Design a binder for this molecule. Structure first.
Ligand SMILES: [Cl-]
Ligand SMILES: [Cl-]
Ligand SMILES: [Cl-]
Ligand SMILES: [Cl-]
Ligand SMILES: [Mg+2]
Ligand SMILES: [Mg+2]
Ligand SMILES: [Mg+2]
Ligand SMILES: [Mg+2]
Ligand SMILES: [Mg+2]
Ligand SMILES: [Mg+2]
Ligand SMILES: [Mg+2]
Ligand SMILES: [Mg+2]
Lengths: 173, 173, 181, 181, 173, 173, 181, 181
């Protein structure tokens, strides 16, 4: 099937067509993979504005969005609030426990879930979902495992690319 | 016509020659597309210094500059103040409402307006203006719609490239 | 407006939808612009098989194909024979002459013609047609003049990309059949 | 799973482990897709010596090699002779015919076959085999269909990369011997 | 030997197999080589999250990690605390003085040490260790001196690449 | 002549041999061309650590270093303090006035001065000096005017490249 | 000054404005540096048609063209005949000899001459002329010596780029006419 | 340790300083690895003129040059004749045989020999010499084994880069003279 990032397989489009929940890793997926730290204890992360638009589009097109994080951080809470993401698990790590809880609370089967990751810690959940996605510049060992590898790098619009894929697959782009 | 970024078409040069108002998107055009967020509620964006010089040159060469934004932010107000941009619409529901108001207030026809964007939300106004510009690394669906696609990426000097184009077209470079 | 090479404009797709004749330059469009010459007067030129597949798809999908080239070589006649191309004009640098001949011979309006070029010599014809195309690595002064600039370079599948575009625009891409020769 | 070209999936490695016959397209796979033509009817094609080394390694490591190509040229018979390839089908664009012939002649199940292609004409056979491979610079519509996309371009060592993959999967890479010819 | 970043020499793999202590330069190795400075005296540096995971893996796989720095900075102390790095020398004149001290305190021979650097100041210690590593975008004069040059740039996952190499060599990846 | 960044002309090496004062533009030369602005009035710029080492090497090898700036900023003052740069002209812009003053105060001829710039505003002074340098990613109209165009981009080590060139030329690298 | 390949210096433009004779190396300048050799003593070289267009534009715009090469091959004579080049020196590695001959034959001062080279053998003549040019992919030791370094590689349109530069400098670019052969 | 291609290690420079014999593979080192084949049994190979210049510089600067190649073709004899190479071994895939012959014929210790290769077949000889070199685009499994990896690709000036390295290491680069043929 034709996409604005290049051809995708029929299998990936079919997986995309059925997604009701999009789970997004933060570091290296929503961000550039960096953490900015300062001498007064400041901590910043950089998110991508066009990803934000994609997320808002998904949320208004009957695709739930969730984030699972290993450490509570106000900046992540603030980003979720800005975007309307209400499913945020923090201080977890481990992703399976939150994944299982999320699926129970939403009554959504794993085949109807997509997950976008950049590192090996993402694989246990990615292995279980309907559409697993590695970002273009993910850890090299993750890349061949995923159903779809984005064209765009983490923090640069990989998430927008996935939102665009789901919306296209579902006739909502 | 010859430019320091490579050839442009006669049609683009002719459009550029007539521009009295340059409207600039912020995120992904003036910036690198990122938003830096911190755990104390800090918010930063990165602007490009050579873009600033271009904007000052435009403003002193009888080309008005305006910005239309979806959310009031002191950092954008400050950037405008530094550069001498006085036409700033913030917290805007869309872009057409501010566009229409701007054109009435300035008594300038749409053909004498340029707009530089990076995403689909920019297209409704871009469709109406004399010179529409997509930055080099804009969303892929926007790129083919624009009159001119910059060589330089958002936040890296795309805006300077557009200012340089207008000034060259108008014999002011 | 998605294509397998990237997005195209609505305007380019609409122009492509109307094409009944695809005219190609040879050197720099069907080849990468090289002319091979030997000490015994031998000459070679290299063509790309995936362009051959595109040309066969076009020819079998109601899109005629013609060639207008400034050089003259029997090898080009042979290439046309392989591909079933029956409209070849060689030794012609004033390409408007051949263009006028084709409009008459094929009873076709210029808006229903596409032309793929790489150098300034191609512009007089490109200016007149419904869909003008510059290959990705065309002369820098030709590039901004064309309706569509290919993603793929001359000799490397620019012609295939144009064939794919016409077929897609005309709803013929999925069912098109060619030989990659 | 580590290779000298980058990680591959467990699925691709498992498919590779089972290959007893490697089928190759010629133009765009064993070459970069160019056909050289001259004024006296001469034709040349270019092959890559490191692909030759891979093919020799495969043939001496209990992996048979066959070629199915839409063009027909004596020069291809000569290249096969250099490399010891004894299964050549030329002038065939309906590649399923030659494929069926090979399955019978070599008494082999399709799951034990790999096919390396670059254009849509290759897909009907690729669809049926155990390991389908598109070269790095294959037609964009073929790329997403294949089990494995090579890192290296057609004519530049894509075939060598596939030979190396099969040998690695089968525990034969370290001890394989070839000639880089 | 095969690695997920490409082939490495037998000699480099053999050096990697024996590493009990990994010493990491900060600027241009753990970071992007930048220092972010503000008008209120703010100072930030950007670390890479996937590097952090590599470091944690090394530390839980019997490979000690140390950092030697030329200026005490809370942000570096905080990064070390987050990752479990306890060997941090700051405000250092040399790197050799800290290196010597570290090896005495840990009773580890230089052949069992790896060092990852990006500039000429790193060379005196790199010259002495078992596995010297220059990052991909290190100063050009350092690159040919090192046993191994990473594929990944400083701040982008060069450190993760080295951790992955050590763990692979030691059968722990 | 041979350099670690590639060949340079005999003319450029000869100009470099005679440099007693190196003048550095800040934005797009010492920095990445960005200015980071926040909603509490924060302003950050990013400097390159390896450039800092080059500057210290120049200063200890009888090459004075100066900076001329268009706006007083504590972050620039702090960077200069860290590096031992004592010739800092701020709130200037033009650059000729400071240049002339600097040369009078130091009793140095223009032929013994190098200047590294990235934009057209740098050209009037660059035109007068012994060794004019445009960074790799300077404004396109500046590039052909300079005696030397660096291989490395602004904020990424262009300044270190120039320091390395001067030191090599003077037999001090 | 803006050019279609990027900005050039005022000094280069002023040098270009004064050129009445353009001297070209062959291998690595008019070609990508390859020499094709066969088992029967055949030899081929490849030239670029867009360079042909530039040469035709120059020759018809009062800029003479000459070639000085270290090799000797009839095929080079044939290429000169195609393009109307009437000043060819082959088998000459001490290129100062041919250069002196040209200055006398064409009654021209060295400042009115341009030379395009790719290797150190070209430098003795380049040192003497008004505009010296190294192609983009010239030997690294030649590159810093030249007045202008082309953006385009040898054999790929470096010569065209130089022709375009001279014509632009002389106010002849828009009206120049060539054949892309 | 600065070179015109980038920095080299002190160890590589010291190895280069001692070289009296430079041995070259052909396919993939002196060429980009392609073999051109025709329907009448024609064969072509392409060599690079700047490599020719380096070889002439080496030969006139007390560095002998030899070739050991797995293929056999008269065209290679002709190339050696052009360049003054008098030590050619063709049809040889067990390259240790030719290597031993050279050591005896030239009364030379292996530490005074350099070898430039591109595939695994070259490794047995490379393992024994004072300076082993893999070209930039050598097979990925060869690259980490070599003392020096060239910056320039096979057929594109990797051999010239090695010649330049030896000459620089021996204080002969400035004064070296060649022909770019
Ligand atoms: Cl033509
Ligand atoms: Cl075929
Ligand atoms: Cl020559
Ligand atoms: Cl061989
Ligand atoms: Mg992550
Ligand atoms: Mg935007
Ligand atoms: Mg042409
Ligand atoms: Mg094919
Ligand atoms: Mg450092
Ligand atoms: Mg600046
Ligand atoms: Mg030459
Ligand atoms: Mg070889």
């Amino acid at each position: 099937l034709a996409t604005c990032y290049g051809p995708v397989s029929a299998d990936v489009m079919a997986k995309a067509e059925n997604i009701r929940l999009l789970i997004l890793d933060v570091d290296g997926v929503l961000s550039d993979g960096l953490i900015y730290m300062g001498n007064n204890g400041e901590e910043l992360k950089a998110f991508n504005v066009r990803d934000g638009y994609g997320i808002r589009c998904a949320l208004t097109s009957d695709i739930e969005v969730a984030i699972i994080t290993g450490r509570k951080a106000k900046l992540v809470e603030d980003r979720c609030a800005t975007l309307g993401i209400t499913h945020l698990y923090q201080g977890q790590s481990n992703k399976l426990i939150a994944f299982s809880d999320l699926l129970e609370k939403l009554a959504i089967a794993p085949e109807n879930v997509a997950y976008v990751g950049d590192d090996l810690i993402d694989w246990p959940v990615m292995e279980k979902v309907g559409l697993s996605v590695a970002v273009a510049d993910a850890h090299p060992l993750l890349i061949p495992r995923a159903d779809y590898v984005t064209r765009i790098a983490g923090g640069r619009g990989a998430v927008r690319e996935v939102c665009d894929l789901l919306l296209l697959a579902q006739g909502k782009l």
